[PDB]
Design a protein around this ligand. Structure first.
Ligand SMILES: CCCCCCCCCCCCCCCC(=O)OC[C@H](COP(=O)(O)OCCN)OC(=O)CCCCCCCCCCCCCCC
Length: 179
């Protein structure tokens, strides 16, 4: 499967799984985490997303901090979008032309979700790894998440004096979202 096929298959899997599970649609958060782990993670490279978000500070973090930040960032995103996922009912997705070369290894896949009549643009950055195509970024409301969080994280690291500050910030954000 090429980049666009990988994205299409994964997104269809997510949509079909939600539509078949009333408990997830009812807002069961544990099940949303499980959905992400089973249906998204195997087709994603979230370590790369986290690396991009940390920028020059990635190398400054201990291996343990790197894991904690990836886990906290992942939790932050799942909790942020859990409502949107649970609210899925009839959404379908159309793909725009794939414009990169077949031999390119870092590409963009562009799509439009029909959200109850409202076009919702979702684009994806996809990289071909030794173990297949993996999504490492998503574009929502015109913005690449890795870029938004790169800027947000750099600001936190600046104001709080380092990587430890970012861990603290992610803990705060996850606590706020849990409420
Ligand atoms: C970094 C790698 C990411 C890989 C992700 C690939 C999988 C894509 C799956 C896409 C499913 C789209 C369903 C939404 C459809 C919709 O229609 O949502 C409709 C809503 C609008 O809702 P509303 O009309 O109620 O208005 C709300 C006001 N009442 O739009 C949105 O909130 C914006 C789009 C949200 C898209 C969410 C995608 C999931 C984010 C990733 C979470 C996992 C991160 C952890 C990574 C390991």
């Amino acid at each position: 499967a090429d980049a666009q096929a990988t994205v299409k298959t994964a997104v269809d899997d997510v949509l079909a799984t939600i539509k078949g599970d009333p408990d997830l649609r009812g807002g069961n958060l544990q099940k949303v985490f499980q959905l992400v782990d089973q249906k998204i993670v195997p087709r994603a490279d979230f370590k790369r997303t986290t690396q991009i978000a940390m920028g020059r500070f990635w190398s400054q973090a201990t291996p343990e901090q790197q894991q904690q930040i990836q886990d906290g960032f992942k939790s932050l995103l799942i909790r942020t979008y859990a409502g949107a996922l649970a609210n899925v009912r009839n959404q379908t997705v159309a793909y725009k032309p794939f414009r990169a070369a077949a031999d390119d290894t870092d590409v963009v896949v562009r799509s439009t979700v029909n959200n109850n009549g409202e076009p919702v643009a979702l684009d994806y950055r996809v990289e071909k790894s030794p173990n297949g195509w993996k999504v490492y970024d998503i574009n929502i409301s015109g913005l690449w998440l890795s870029e938004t969080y790169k800027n947000q994280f750099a600001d936190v690291i600046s104001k709080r004096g380092g990587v430890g500050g970012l861990v603290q910030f992610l803990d705060e954000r996850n606590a706020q979202l849990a409420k």
